[PDB]
């Protein structure tokens, strides 16, 4: 079971887990309650499997889009912040963590992708996706490339898919309609086709992942990348002279990144819900707590009004918020896991040439709109049926 009287926290390995551990250590010094921060791989897939049995961490950090599914499954606790606490965070961030009328996590920070570029290689970054091939040809003549970003997670390609009309779920008459999906409309197809054409024409490689893109950009080998605020820390260390700015347009339309609110959910099986509330409200969601995490890896535009008033002065946060305004806050509905798996499969398959864009996105539409020792006992029932009446075992 989960251990009473301590806290275990999971957070993704791209975030400021060392800074979060500093907050945990302060909490322990003050209250005697040990706090252990972990960053497992694939935590967003591990959590629902282990929480189903009452195991897992006390607190899970992820963007809010996964949390409605966890809540529907009974894996996240309703939280109980009072009115004065709620007043400390922006109303729109509370909206992101509301599911079936209930608050099911504490919002931490607003994440949007931006275009990150090397000012020495590219003092003037491209306004449009369309001009990137010509820019790549120029840079290749100098032993560089124009653009590298993670092609294994559809989060990074979504802004281009959505630019000219792609969408996840239609919102109408007060709700998201899971039978009205926008992953295979003309705009979505156009965006993915453009990415695939970049690859076919050798301006990008289908196998490029988070680490490959980050290494290339930070080594000064590629002029641009697409990433979130957490990435800025390593670029600071790299000493690349970088800027953070608005994503390129496609067909003249803004790229529309899906915006995530990094949020802290409490395991519904935790015996430490009160401890988790104290930690999150009175240690983490304070200027000093968020600063500790932010100094490790930038959070983005934080949900905490007092600290955001400081971070807002950062032009990189200004760029983050411009991209956020052009994009959309993700739904939190349970169907989001199906949507993301479907689009992940489509992007990887189209990029690698395993499927055409039309084939891949048709499949994504179908799966996106398809609604998302018990074993020992079932085997036993089936065995018992073979022994009913005068039936016998064995010949
Ligand atoms: O690629 C699909 C993936 O997108 C989002 O995950 C982001 C996450 O929001 C960020 O915090 C950061 O970790 O990068 C991830 C992309 O690799 C969704 O939140 C996630 O549910 C979805 O599977």
Curated annotation (Swiss-Prot):
Transmembrane segments: none annotated. InterPro entries: Maltose/Cyclodextrin-bd, SBP, SBP_1_CS. One of its GO terms (cellular component) is outer membrane-bounded periplasmic space. Gene3D superfamilies: Periplasmic binding protein-like II. It is found in: Periplasm. GO terms for molecular function: carbohydrate transmembrane transporter activity; maltose binding. Pfam families: SBP_bac_1. Its main location: periplasm. Induction: Induced by maltose and the transcriptional regulator MalT. Permanently repressed by cold shock in a PNPase-dependent fashion. It comes from the Bacteria. The keyword Signal applies. The keyword DNA damage does not apply. Keywords: Periplasm, Signal, Sugar transport, Transport. GO terms for biological process: carbohydrate transport; cell chemotaxis; detection of maltose stimulus; DNA damage response; maltodextrin transmembrane transport; maltose transport. Belongs to the bacterial solute-binding protein 1 family. Part of the ABC transporter complex MalEFGK involved in maltose/maltodextrin import. Binds maltose and higher maltodextrins such as maltotriose. The complex is composed of two ATP-binding proteins (MalK), two transmembrane proteins (MalG and MalF) and a solute-binding protein (MalE). This is Maltose/maltodextrin-binding periplasmic protein. The gene is malE.
